[PDB]
């Protein structure tokens, strides 16, 4: 079997391994909810990248990753 002519659709996205800041549920290109009206990105050892303000507030609350039970560590 073979295909004489084909039509396809592709959803291009940035090659970054992290997609969204899972605190404010905002994309990382724009600013955090605290930061929309008036920012850097904080990574983690567990490949968890979130907004700097969101990470600061979260670590002010507790030293637990928002997704899994791991101790938060800077980069």
């Amino acid at each position: 079997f073979e295909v004489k002519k084909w039509n396809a659709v592709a959803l291009w996205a940035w090659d970054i391994v992290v997609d969204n800041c899972a605190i404010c549920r905002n994309h990382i290109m724009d600013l955090c909810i605290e930061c929309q009206a008036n920012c850097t990105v904080a990574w983690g050892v567990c490949n968890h990248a979130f907004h700097f303000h969101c990470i600061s507030r979260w670590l002010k609350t507790r030293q637990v990753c928002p997704l899994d039970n791991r101790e938060w560590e800077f980069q």
Binding site: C24, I33, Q36
Partner: protein
């Protein structure tokens, strides 16, 4: 089913936008009463959805758990940040 999925995605985006609006207003004011904050949130989001008061109060209740907005020690009507 897809219509219901879209009408629930609009609710989720509505909740996120309400939380963002509450945080922005409480960072532009740093203190507001409940009766004024609800009206300010409604007035800010009018080009988009008209938000039901239950949704704004649920968002302002769940932002307390995230400590973005906190109730002042004088009364629960007053609001502040931390």
């Amino acid at each position: 089913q897809e219509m219901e999925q879209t009408r629930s995605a609009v609710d989720e985006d509505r909740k996120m936008y309400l939380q963002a609006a509450i945080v922005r207003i409480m960072k532009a004011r740093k203190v507001l009463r409940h009766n004024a904050l609800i009206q300010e949130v409604i007035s800010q989001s009018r080009a988009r959805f008209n938000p039901s008061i239950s949704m704004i109060k649920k968002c302002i209740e769940v932002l307390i758990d995230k400590q973005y907005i906190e109730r002042s020690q004088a009364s629960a009507d007053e609001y502040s940040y931390v």
